[PDB]
């Protein structure tokens, strides 16, 4: 049994898989090899397979801000990207955002289009950021040492120091 790699396919015998860009049309026999037929126009198959039909290419919806980076072939799917300077939300680039924001407890290090998405940092001790923002940096804690004020409430990465007398 066992069956070799990049050949795989077992069913009383060991058959060769179809090369990427080819669908499976007929199984192999004792004396005949596996029969594979190429994928049709607008269709693909990206791996050594035993698939009887090819998959359709994904479309880069202009209304989603998508633009085709690489036209799909019979072995690879269409690769999409954003308009620029729009940024992909996933590695798959299935949606675009102008830029990402930095949630409370995080501050910005800017967004300059073309790979340059917002760089966030986690607010060091003595700094805070309430609000979700794509421009706001971490702000420093009040003082409570200026007018020789108290301290009253600690001060978080999300909240500021609150002071009395």
């Amino acid at each position: 049994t066992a069956c070799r790699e990049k050949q795989y396919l077992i069913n009383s015998q060991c058959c060769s898989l179809c090369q990427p860009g080819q669908k499976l049309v007929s199984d192999c026999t004792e004396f005949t090899e596996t029969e594979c037929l190429p994928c049709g126009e607008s269709e693909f198959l990206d791996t050594w397979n035993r698939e009887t039909h090819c998959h359709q290419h994904k479309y880069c919806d202009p209304n989603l801000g998508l633009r085709v980076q690489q036209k799909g072939t019979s072995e690879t799917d269409t690769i999409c990207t954003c308009e620029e300077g729009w940024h992909c939300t996933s590695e798959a680039c299935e949606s675009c955002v102008l830029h990402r924001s930095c949630s409370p407890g995080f501050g910005v290090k800017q967004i300059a289009t073309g790979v340059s998405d917002t760089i966030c940092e986690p607010c060091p001790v003595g700094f805070f950021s309430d609000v979700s923002s794509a421009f706001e940096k971490c702000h420093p804690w009040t003082s409570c040492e200026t007018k020789d004020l108290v301290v009253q409430q600690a001060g978080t990465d999300k909240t500021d120091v609150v002071c009395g007398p």
Partner: nanobody
Amino acid sequence: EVQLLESGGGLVQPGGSLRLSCAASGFTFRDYEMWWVRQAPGKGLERVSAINPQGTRTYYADSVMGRFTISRDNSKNTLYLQMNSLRAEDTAVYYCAKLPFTFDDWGQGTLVTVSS
């Protein structure tokens, strides 16, 4: 449901000034961070300015600092951009964007042309 309707954009002479507005509807405008972005024809997308919900904190691009002013009327649910000392580089289509800045979270645009 988000509608952002830019206006104020027209043909102005260099050195001149314009006031752009973005009328928001379909969301609680007073609670969202807003941005102004411009796109020159052919040339790249550029982030001009940004404002926090209360209108107390702002950001400006180095290329527009000192000449441009972002502001908001949370009663009327409108965002503004006062453009002064206008130059030909400022010729672009101006858009306004709503956080979380999806391709659905921005307007139709308003054309600003700076020439003689």
